[PDB]
Swiss-Prot record, chain D:
Free-text activity regulation comment from the record: Strongly inhibited by sialic acid alditol.
Broad class of where this protein is predominantly found: cytoplasm
Keyword Cell inner membrane in record: no
InterPro entries assigned to the protein according to its UniProt record, in alphabetical order: Aldolase_TIM, DapA-like, NanA, Schiff_base-form_aldolases_AS
PROSITE patterns: DHDPS_2
Domain of life: Bacteria
Reaction catalysis annotation: aceneuramate = aldehydo-N-acetyl-D-mannosamine + pyruvate
Organism whose genome encodes this protein: Staphylococcus aureus (strain NCTC 8325 / PS 47)
Residue ranges of the TM segments: none
Entry similarity comment: Belongs to the DapA family. NanA subfamily.
Pathway the protein acts in: Amino-sugar metabolism; N-acetylneuraminate degradation; D-fructose 6-phosphate from N-acetylneuraminate: step 1/5
HAMAP family: N_acetylneuram_lyase
PANTHER family for the chain: N-ACETYLNEURAMINATE LYASE
Protein name: N-acetylneuraminate lyase
Length: 294, 298, 293, 291
């Protein structure tokens, strides 16, 4: 099917900032490039959670969208996250990413307020109507507190422009049901640490923050698992989970950015209120980098 | 320069200001002016909580939030207390809004707890400190676990409340044990409760006042509940709470922001629409609503 | 004629020997202290607070029988006979009724995800086999079970479901239930919020800390109903120092340690509850002196 | 015996008074082994309606199940209970019968400290001298076990493994690699294939009483790298599991067994019996998957 066009493995693009929380355009270019050339991924997921997107103004997000695309070739896959509590902004950001040639939009489920399902649905439908691009639903119950049922996915997936879902719920019974119920829809998993379990559950790819530094083992996990080399794939998951668990204990986005500064990348700073990497973790992280050759 | 800038006590009852929008999500300025005046003149409230949850703030852009602050302010007398909710996931935005509200003469800022990301406590703390340091205004911690996922502990309240510019808290956790502790541990800080439907329990727990969306339509009952409970007329206070919770329950089952704005249309106010993705009031609730306005004189 | 069940009740605490057998002598002592020293209206026997879910059927009968023996005929007696084993619940309800207990009460079936109609008919069945009055015992904090407005209606429609021991931390739902069922007995079970429950129109309360703080609690309840609210709330501050302290040290062992300071043979908790930790003793002695316990 | 393998969480048939039906029980037990080709029985678990039973009933269930099956059959006795004296008495009784290991649910209802939970295990082990499997079930109890707590527990040589039911494959993978020499049995039937490629040594399940064969294929194929076929069988098994959950799991599984000529009797109240409004739908599932 054509709904599997955007299959494969994406870096959820991190963003470097200066002291005043402004995008460092030069390090951004480098991080994009690092994800394609060094990590060998199929594409970038731009302005997602990992890019500190929800801390940004509209101009900043356009800035990220623009530099990301300029920074890669025509054959690279590009998904633009335009979700926002401000639907006018979401539509604005959607038209903008679309006119730039991003292959698909996506949008986090509306959050903060307890939106009814019907409100959630027409939020997606409205971005679609006004942009005419393909749309990937970004189901993330850990950050939003919003869960979507099988019946609700049926209604959503009945829209010929809702091409699939970045799936985040820690539930493999639900993953399996969705997989069986929507076999020609696109499913990308967003739990780096359960990449192997997602892969055997038939996901079409994955989107991840840790693939910015560990994209190579991720592709082995994904290929070894589909080739039935379950054991070798799983061993790489152990390896990948030492890395993920370690990086989470130190604060994931600044820490990943730090692993990149070690490759000689201008990885700048997180945007406040996120704090910079705590040096009291320097030794422990050096030991991690050497161990896994990061 | 040498202007006698009077420091209002922030005690009392506030409307969390509702905002009316047009078909494209832009602010209806005359609608807003009427809504603010209804809060003061008809509902007899002490002040306005501006750009809060109830005002659909987290759906707006920076310019629109600036707009709301300006209109609400220009629409009330100088006796009226104003609190500016400037909290936002974009800290540059919050500082900007905070300087802007402060230059307009808003009596305090508050900011919701940073949400969405699992921010550490040291991150939440410094978010507040950074707003304070850039605005130099008094700050009220907006503590809302039901919308944010963020709870705050007693030891952490001590750390925040040790900043002389953190003057108090907008309290919404449905926990009357923690409220009591906080009340006793911080006797000279300001506590304003945010659960309309538990105003009576909050009042007897020693809160200094309250902020609510429903006060926009039930502000006179609220006052009665507040005053009677403190005057020891406990039974009459609670009976008025039975009535209030009738209203609150009904309005919650219909979509609270649109419905309250619809109760206000009915008084000739230009109540417009909510901002999408909120849907407009569903006409199927109409008759049930008319029954409620009639039984309760809204 | 039936008694008026309104009032203040101790959730009765139970002393154990080194083997988790009941210490009958100390039990009588704890019961007597609740009525004579703490001036409470009744006992609620075999509730969470008496470590009842740790007990076998014979032990629960022991406690029923000792409690009743310990007190005068004017003393209100409510029997918690709820149990995952419905046959057991029925056997204890009948046993407690034949003893003269004024009402039965029963926890919401828990552990399994029982459907509401299952929860309903557990109550209706206990009632039908015992023919005593029943009090729904709702504790979301321990069971993870919530009961909706509509669900209380179904239950309360039954003439022999006479009320509810309420412990959900939700004063909106308390108020709803209060408005809708003015004919039903509401007893609250959160000591640290007795003032809030009192201004919300509860007909009394059941608590474990009233075994040591029953006098302040009566005052909180009386003062607040009489609208002397500033003073009730101040006694809640005081009561909450006690509750918070007791909570942080292991509430049931600590409560029985306090009772122990009064000459009561309050023995041990039943394993796997661990006994009071000596490292807490100085801080505990400081509580006893401050509030004269 | 090696404790590896696939177990039926043994269902119990009752009469109208919630008394055990011993003949039906012998039959359900033999069905798991002879018809379902399972390695063992997990006796008096949640699926057995254990927590609705009295002490003597629990003993009756242990006795019937053991006398029902051959010596080569693996047997685990769930003895956990809030009454530690009852757990110790049942663990002694099940050990004297020859049960290969004990397990005990995490103590629940009350907010026990971890230290209290630890010593509940250690005391049971001390008095029984049998091996012990921690039955950790956050869905039913509200208790999660952290990785550092596992280590304190698994440091005991007699705590041989864990029946793991937390729906968290991050935590499972951490435990799998922190305790390569411990036994891990997964208890979520609907995620058997994810558990298998995560290194579980086998699994315990109520639905295996009717779909034990497919489950064996899921286990075997997945370990063989036959990943697509294993996952397909999980789709099939998940149709069965979903349907069974929507109708009342214990009574419905017992209805499937009754269709096989087994005296599956009733659930113990307050569980209600199978609702006949589900019969057509249940008949169709049985026709479709040859149950």
């Amino acid at each position: 099917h054509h709904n599997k066009d955007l299959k494969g493995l994406y870096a959820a693009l991190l963003v470097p900032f200066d002291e005043n929380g402004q995008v460092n355009e030069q390090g951004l270019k480098q991080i994009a490039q690092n994800a394609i050339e060094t990590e060998e991924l199929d594409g970038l997921y731009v302005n997602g959670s990992s890019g500190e997107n929800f801390l940004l103004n509209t101009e900043q997000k356009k800035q990220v969208f623009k530099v990301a695309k300029e920074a890669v070739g025509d054959k690279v896959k590009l998904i633009a996250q335009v979700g926002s509590l401000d639907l006018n902004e979401a539509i604005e950001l959607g038209k903008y990413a679309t006119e730039l040639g991003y292959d698909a939009l996506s949008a986090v489920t509306p959050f903060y307020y307890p939106f009814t399902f019907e409100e959630i649905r027409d939020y997606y439908f409205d971005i679609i109507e006004a942009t005419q691009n393909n749309m990937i639903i970004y189901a993330i119950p850990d950050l939003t507190g919003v869960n979507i049922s099988i019946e609700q996915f049926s209604e959503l997936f009945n829209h010929e422009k809702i091409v699939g879902v970045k799936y985040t719920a820690p539930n493999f019974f639900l993953l399996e049901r969705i997989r069986k119920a929507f076999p020609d829809k696109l499913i990308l998993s967003g739990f780096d640490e359960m990449l192997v379990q997602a892969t055997i559950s038939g996901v079409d790819g994955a989107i991840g923050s840790t693939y910015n530094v560990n994209g190579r083992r991720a592709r082995k996990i994904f290929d070894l698992a589909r080739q039935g080399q379950i054991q070798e794939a799983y061993q790489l998951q152990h390896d990948s989970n030492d890395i993920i668990e370690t990086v989470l204990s130190m604060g994931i986005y600044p820490t990943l950015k730090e692993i990149l500064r070690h490759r000689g990348i201008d990885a700048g700073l997180p945007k406040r209120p996120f704090k910079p990497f705590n040096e009291a973790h320097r030794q422990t992280l050096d030991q991690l980098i050497a161990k896994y050759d990061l």
